[PDB]
Design a protein around this ligand. Structure first.
Ligand code: BOM
Ligand code: BOM
Lengths: 137, 137
């Protein structure tokens, strides 16, 4: 649901300021987060991949290979309002996008690739929200 | 708590190198200690069963019948940050896993079975650490 996706999106972005400082990321990521759920907007900055990776790492959502930790993603999803089925469906998109995008040793570009694939799949479910406030803000 | 399980996992395995040097053991067990908590991973080596016994025995967590000593297991769990409810929950998993695992006269193998049952239940509670997955150092 769009509603849940808004709540997940705002809770996922809350540490962005903390990641921006800590990783010295430029303001190039600002347009990607402001536009994250705008259908047809292409996210293409490498640093946004870095930012997303930092955000996941901070929510304990990553394993030591860099793939999603299913336990903590499920717990995150549930904490912000998804039921079991919606939570599993989101895990399955992320997991599907990890297997469907080309392996890349540059973790920031690979995380970007996962995130773009995830965004597209959420648009296809008609779950992308209309945000009044940007992710990260 | 995953933070607590991290603290107990680091500290339970601190004497592994001492364990390895004293006994028998191939470096084949390192794969099980380094990857213990990963969601896909199954602990697999027989000497890891033997390592866990030496670590338990050295921490004074094993009774005369070979079973967990609940009093000292409580002390170890609390020392490393478990409150009483989580401590008791860990004891009850161990104790349940001592019952549900098939009897065996190889103690190394039986301990491997109790440890794999313990791991599975910590995954079910979402208490396995997501990025810091090792037992020991
Ligand atoms: C698992 C639930 C995700 C929820 C909300 C996401 C909002 C925008 C961020 C999407 C990126 C998720 C993919 C990340 C895995 C690798 O960091
Ligand atoms: C009850 C406390 C155990 C704490 C931490 C364990 C980390 C690795 C898990 C190994 C399985 C435990 C097996 C029982 C042996 C007694 O310590």
């Amino acid at each position: 649901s769009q509603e849940v996706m808004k709540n997940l999106s705002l809770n996922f972005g809350k540490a962005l300021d903390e990641c921006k400082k800590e990783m010295t990321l430029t303001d190039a990521i600002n347009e990607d987060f402001y536009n994250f759920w705008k259908e047809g907007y292409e996210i293409k900055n490498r640093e946004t991949g870095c930012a997303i990776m930092c955000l996941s790492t901070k929510l304990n959502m990553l394993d030591p290979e860099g793939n999603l930790h299913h336990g903590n993603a499920m717990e995150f999803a549930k904490k912000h309002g998804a039921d079991e089925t919606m939570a599993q469906q989101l895990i399955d998109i992320v997991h599907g996008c990890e297997k469907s995008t080309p392996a890349n040793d540059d973790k920031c570009i690979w995380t970007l690739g996962v995130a773009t694939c995830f965004k597209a799949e959420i648009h296809k479910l008609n779950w992308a929200p209309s945000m009044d406030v940007a992710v990260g803000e």
